[PDB]
Design a protein around this ligand. Sequence first.
Ligand SMILES: Nc1ccn([C@@H]2O[C@H](COP(=O)(O)OP(=O)(O)OP(=O)(O)O)[C@@H](O)[C@H]2O)c(=O)n1
Ligand SMILES: Nc1ccn([C@@H]2O[C@H](COP(=O)(O)OP(=O)(O)OP(=O)(O)O)[C@@H](O)[C@H]2O)c(=O)n1
Ligand SMILES: [Zn+2]
Ligand SMILES: [Zn+2]
Lengths: 153, 153, 310, 310, 310, 310
Amino acid sequence: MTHDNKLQVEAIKRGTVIDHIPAQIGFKLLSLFKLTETDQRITIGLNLPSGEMGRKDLIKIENTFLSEDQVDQLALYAPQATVNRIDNYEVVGKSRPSLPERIDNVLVCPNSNCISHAEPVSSSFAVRKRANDIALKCKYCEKEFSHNVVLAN
Amino acid sequence: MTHDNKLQVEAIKRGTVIDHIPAQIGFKLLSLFKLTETDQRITIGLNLPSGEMGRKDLIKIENTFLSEDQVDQLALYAPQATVNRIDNYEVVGKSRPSLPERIDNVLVCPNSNCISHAEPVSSSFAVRKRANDIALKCKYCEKEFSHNVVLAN
Amino acid sequence: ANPLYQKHIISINDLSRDDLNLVLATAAKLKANPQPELLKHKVIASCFFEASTRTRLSFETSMHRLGASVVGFSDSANTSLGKKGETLADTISVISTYVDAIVMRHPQEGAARLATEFSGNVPVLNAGDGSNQHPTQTLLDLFTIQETQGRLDNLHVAMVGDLKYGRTVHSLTQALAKFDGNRFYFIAPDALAMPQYILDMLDEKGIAWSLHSSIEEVMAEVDILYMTRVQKERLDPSEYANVKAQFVLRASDLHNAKANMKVLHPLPRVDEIATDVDKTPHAWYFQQAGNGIFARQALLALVLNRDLVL
Amino acid sequence: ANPLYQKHIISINDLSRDDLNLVLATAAKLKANPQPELLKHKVIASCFFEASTRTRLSFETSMHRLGASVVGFSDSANTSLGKKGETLADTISVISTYVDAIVMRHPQEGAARLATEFSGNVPVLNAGDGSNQHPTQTLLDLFTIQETQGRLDNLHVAMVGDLKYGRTVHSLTQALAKFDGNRFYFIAPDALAMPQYILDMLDEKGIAWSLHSSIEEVMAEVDILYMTRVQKERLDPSEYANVKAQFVLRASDLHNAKANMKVLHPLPRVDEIATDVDKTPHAWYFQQAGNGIFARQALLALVLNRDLVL
Amino acid sequence: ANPLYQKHIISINDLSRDDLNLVLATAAKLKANPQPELLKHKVIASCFFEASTRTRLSFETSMHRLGASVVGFSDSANTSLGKKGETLADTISVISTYVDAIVMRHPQEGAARLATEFSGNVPVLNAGDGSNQHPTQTLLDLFTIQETQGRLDNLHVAMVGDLKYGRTVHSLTQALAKFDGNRFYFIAPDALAMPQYILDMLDEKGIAWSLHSSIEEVMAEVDILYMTRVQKERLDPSEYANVKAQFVLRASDLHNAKANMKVLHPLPRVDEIATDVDKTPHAWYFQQAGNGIFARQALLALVLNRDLVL
Amino acid sequence: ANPLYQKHIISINDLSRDDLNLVLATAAKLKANPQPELLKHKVIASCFFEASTRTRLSFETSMHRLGASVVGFSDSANTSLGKKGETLADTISVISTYVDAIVMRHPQEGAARLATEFSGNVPVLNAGDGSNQHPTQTLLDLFTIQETQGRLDNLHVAMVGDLKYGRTVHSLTQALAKFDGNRFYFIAPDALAMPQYILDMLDEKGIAWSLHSSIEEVMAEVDILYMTRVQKERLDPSEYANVKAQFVLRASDLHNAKANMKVLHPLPRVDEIATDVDKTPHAWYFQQAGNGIFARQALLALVLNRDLVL
Ligand SMILES: Nc1ccn([C@@H]2O[C@H](COP(=O)(O)OP(=O)(O)OP(=O)(O)O)[C@@H](O)[C@H]2O)c(=O)n1
Ligand SMILES: Nc1ccn([C@@H]2O[C@H](COP(=O)(O)OP(=O)(O)OP(=O)(O)O)[C@@H](O)[C@H]2O)c(=O)n1
Ligand SMILES: [Zn+2]
Ligand SMILES: [Zn+2]
């Protein structure tokens, strides 16, 4: 409780605010990282007017503190986000993401003869080579692809 | 004012507020009806306190009037959902979903041999309230299934 | 222009009573005076993605008897389309680029109706789609009931055999329910029962039906006895042979049938109708296959011609 | 008697500019007024020793649209010839004993031209021979460029896809080099590059060509965009999918194409051209398959007729 | 000698309560204190006229952990015996002069029993004969029920799936009906129900059984849930996808189960048991397949050794 | 325990310099002083979901010369596991309760690694997984390079053929790049060249490599000539017959070779190595296949034995 409004919405009593999500990564992030399967109040702001990107997206999850490597799975999609941890109306913490060494479950190996497709295992990629442009190697078939390519399909 | 409710509300000017989304159908509806593929401001609230109806979800889509056909599709998922349009700061229409005649696109034929599976086709089912339940007949294979078989797959 | 002009004959549930009677009165005229040049210069495609010789030879002969040319393939014997990843939408968008109508059989249910979304104005006629429809087998059956019984209403029709999976008994029961005062007798083993959705549709229209375990219970009253083949793989070896294989007709059972009673069977018959039955006047299964020529001719005539002078 | 009378249409390198224009002006007349009885009483053989449905149905329909009869076989599905040790010379010396022209596809390169040594005076038309020629696919492609662009010279033609093994891009580049001031843009992954013998022939005639890695680099200037299918077995799974699978067209890339630009694709297309492209006015792959009817009709008319009154 | 010494193991019907207990007792001892040179110098034949990888490898690993040698075969589109002309009787008459025991699986029922009349004094063990019998699966099921529940009588056993044609469920009910006070719950699609013969038997012995509609209805009282696979072949795709809101098992469904409730499946478990059941305490189908080794070792040791003092 | 005790052998990437040397050391000891009862009482599974006669027999002969028992299968148009529905995960979960080790070869990449997550504590050894990995071929190649040249570093190794898709050449380069000072010459058709990833790796380590056009260019400096087969599938017959005046090996070509130069080939060697090379001193591909036995014996003994004091 404190004056929400909605161009930049306000105060959750303790929880996580992932702010500065680029436009249209917000919903993708809720889809991929299953952030919605909580009984907690989640408030989400989509296509919002501020912090210069101009338009950003924002997610607020009360009472859940997702962190350190959760914040890092966010790096491939929302690298400039800030993940504000909050206790008793104050941002007792501000993180940003960094490339993790491993991205589990969220990607799909583009190699169609990979065994990963058909089975009760989850995908796993070894990550490497920061901002000049990321390569991802499948755990199973050991084929290294360009992140642009895995991230398309 | 306070018995919280609002806390300085995301009261919008023109738009659609879908209120009383049953809990957990909230995200389902964004995905299925592709409601986030817009540039207008959306604010979503999940697992809200609705002491008055346990838990609910609510999507606020601005400068968007989602209507008639669009409203009726939601019947299968959120049958007690009030859509309210807002023209200039208050409720101008407050519609309820009624079961439609056909349900297109969103739904998959249970029938593994139905041609809809391998092809560039938008699914389509003809809706029939066979009093007790709703049966859905596929356009293509013409097999009829309870809406509960279809709503998983 | 006649109602069927340039329509897609995809399903029996889309053809009305009037549509049905129009095809059946045209079949009767073509049977009586031939019009062997009516579809002159028309080219028709006969696409049988799943092989079915009986049906193909008959569709094509009736195309030939109205003067049309035929190009096409029988497959389930790898004649190259479906290779690479050619979708059915794409095959039909290229085939309707040069033929005047498509006749097609396909293994998945719904394939003919999807073809319809891609053909433009080339009519699609369904020669069978998986376990869903087969309009032209129901049209020839009906024509054979009408021609031998004089009517399509007030009939006492027994359906015998595998009623659960038999695609043609399900459609002929929906067509006959379009008409009046027909009465049904179903005689099926327990595992091969007529599905509830048929029975529920019959009840809802006030049509009378009943289940019997012996043909002998109902022979006397019966006008059309439609026999179906049981496929033994739908049961096990010992089930098929056990007390359930007595859905077989012999000449001796016809003893007391009405003079007008006819035995109909879509075919192949393997043993459910014994060979001694063929010598009786009630055997009409082959004359029924012969009538497939005029019912398919009539549908092609009506669909490709604006106006028809009879 | 016209120049093509009773010739063998074996290869694009044997047909001159004038030959090409004659087939293409006849295709245009048959498209406009039909001559459905021109090949009346002619019987033609359609020998497809290697199955190819798309090509067969089209050759045969165009035979049917000029009134000829067709006998023949599709094989790669053991229809008995080749048994014992029947050489191809012997099969063609018996088939030319009763048909008036042979259309044939065969897996080895050179088979149509050998057929020519044994047919006597029965013309042989090649419907594809291994990785060598396919005249009738290049004739329908050309007709589709001419009909939509008004010309066959001064064109900006981009060829996209597997340019190394694609039998039709190699022939259409040799046909277009017969004409003037055409400009080529090749966009191919490194492993699927256009062969040197094409490039050397282009250089030697002063024709301009260039390699680009993105369609986006050249869209603006382009009149005909000929897309080819990559077969994934020519690369490995992970190669196909890696950065090299971006030779795929989507509607969004057409953003800035000239109003006259057309997308052509011999087919099957599986994913190199996305389905949303079909709704654009630039999608002409199916109208291109439809034009195969008039280009094959024209070749059969010109080859079997002395004189043709148009 | 022990009761089963030199005996033929063909049907669960032929082995009494005490023979079953003897086997289960031995298997518990061989699991505990292995004796790897017990059949040193015996050669067993693994004649799989019908292929089963899982069953063949369990058997041959059994033969090898007791030190025996193995000669044999499996057959799909292959290796000679039977062919047609070669009788099963003559194959067995010839192989009975070479080996010390014959484990065989054959597609026609009673093949193992026919074999018994030609093998001389060579014991034959049935690994599957059509839809009739599979004793060594029943033996490993009962060993898994006995080592997890502690007893083989007074159990509340739920049987689920295709009860009409799961051969292992017909055997398992026969065998559990030789012990006392067992209550049976049979949850099947009514198209796929327990035959009247199993039920007719169970009432003569006074055993309590009931039929339920879904597992959720008995989850609370059950000790063994024996899941069978529903066979899509003899079911329509639309029927198969229709039954209830299914009869597949998920961990959500298990939240009610007793702590000692175990889920068994002869395997393969394609989709009726979801992957999340695999991580619960109740999942016992893989441990069940490992007990195949101990159950089969026990049978081979008792058949080929007179007295086993282990 | 020894470093590799109970370890999974899936990729050459995962075994360090010292692990490779350990294997090669053991293999030299097992070649010298055989120990045929070392795995007495172990049962290994030879799961060849993809058939390789040469690899399967080398492995099973390895299993048997250390006294182990073998259960397993190979598969072309045959025997059950996988089928579709049966997951690899469930096959391995079931077979891990029966055996002590799993050697497997499968057509999809990473199948051996998927297996490792279901085999419990049962070691799995990769015998081929698609185009990814084949460690035991690399292990026998390095044992053949070490016993003929005396060392595994400072070698002038020539690699020839399809460098782009020979899976053994990608592994061999990875492994020889863990030892020091090796110089590589890569003679390939440029259609078939070393991928940039191998090369990109080699430059980070500082290794010297060069690409040549024909073996004759390096014959004088080379110690190992590792010949690979050029795969006619992914090559046009005309391209294949065109490259250079080839890259096949004949004794005439060898007149220049060093006395210790050996020619290796993973086999089969259809035609790139002529029969006259077989009689020279430099021919070592058959001796190389015999060393498969010693390399595979070493790996099985270290994986299944804690301490080997041989
Ligand atoms: N109890 C609170 C306090 C703050 N916020 C959210 O915390 C986010 C950012 O934290 P803050 O440091 O308080 O504002 P900024 O200084 O703008 O943070 P930054 O500069 O890193 O964006 C804002 O989106 C605000 O909505 C919140 O929802 N609930
Ligand atoms: N300027 C406005 C006016 C209304 N609303 C929303 O529109 C909905 C309309 O409900 P309303 O008729 O105003 O009162 P309720 O009793 O909440 O409607 P209902 O009976 O459906 O619960 C409310 O959720 C309210 O937040 C809004 O966001 N902005
Ligand atoms: Zn992979
Ligand atoms: Zn359907």
